[PDB]
Design a protein around this ligand. Sequence first.
Ligand SMILES: [Mg+2]
Ligand code: NI
Ligand code: NI
Ligand code: NI
Lengths: 138, 138, 138
Amino acid sequence: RRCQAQVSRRISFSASHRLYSKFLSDEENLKLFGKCNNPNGHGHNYKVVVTVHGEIDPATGMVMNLADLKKYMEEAIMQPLDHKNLDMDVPYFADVVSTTENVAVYIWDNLQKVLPVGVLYKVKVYETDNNIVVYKGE
Amino acid sequence: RRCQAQVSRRISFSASHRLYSKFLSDEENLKLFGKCNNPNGHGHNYKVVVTVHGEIDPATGMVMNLADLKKYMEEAIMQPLDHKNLDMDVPYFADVVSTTENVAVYIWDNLQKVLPVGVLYKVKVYETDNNIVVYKGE
Amino acid sequence: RRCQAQVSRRISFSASHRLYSKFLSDEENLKLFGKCNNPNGHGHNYKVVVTVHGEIDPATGMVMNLADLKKYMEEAIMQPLDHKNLDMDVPYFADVVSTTENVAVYIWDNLQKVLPVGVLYKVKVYETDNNIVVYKGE
Ligand SMILES: [Mg+2]
Ligand code: NI
Ligand code: NI
Ligand code: NI
């Protein structure tokens, strides 16, 4: 009887960061991360596209309540990340390298705590227009 | 065997609509759809990406000729939807809620009435730059 | 915990081409390819998104070092294609129609000559903003 669909919302946030691993030497960190290892940091206007999936509810015509998704993304992404320094203001990145990959995983994990089981499909993070990460929970 | 590929074409159309259900009351439609339930409607420049798939023809190099795909899209999307009020001018939406999910399904179904069997892979609809639905016939 | 992810990089290149098949007469070529068959050619600012996948490395927080990806893409896409006439300057297209489908396959194949095994996931080519091909090695 029924249709599955994927629904996405895009938002952006501003954050600064520095790429470095506490396990590596200062020289190793420079060789590996180059300009991204700048000691005082750099920054991005991150874009995040969150995709959920499920059945199109025949009564409402939606996979998910859109207000709820706004609230969920506001709580899981904007509040903790927006206008923040990832490595100093977000406790999770005290011991985790703030690569775009790890930002995608962090966002996924934050969303899975609010969202109904089985509904989250994909998190996509643009560090810049040209550099993208997609995480699907695999 | 020969290579298989996905080929897409993007178009846009302008339409107005209003989100409301026949099954819910005035109070309930307002709580669920909020500003989208505005009695006199609102509107969008919808963007649609239609993807087809198949073998790359070894003599012509094409999965599908883009001039054909433009004609199918003109018949299945532009003629019925462009510069229209969805809820009043498109009979299908007389008793279906015009959410972006249901628009993606409507376009899929129209395309299938018009296209050769087995070629459609995906229909993606942007209601705005930030709100997207993907339907893959599942 | 190991986490797989997709990582993409986008670049562009300028090239000219002409669409025609040695298996068609001039009339047929003109009928099939229309304005794309213009004898002196036409051109595009092609955009390419290359997507790799794999495990997020716990030490570096990356699936793949960007520097490498950029090198591979420079060698597989920019050097052979950028500011070129596809049909006259790229030997591969001497006997292959330079459709966007065949450009995606060509890029895929070039990339596989230099990427490690099991890393290449997707090649996406935009011939224009509105005409896209995706190839996944199928
Ligand atoms: Mg259907
Ligand atoms: Ni950065
Ligand atoms: Ni609307
Ligand atoms: Ni062309």
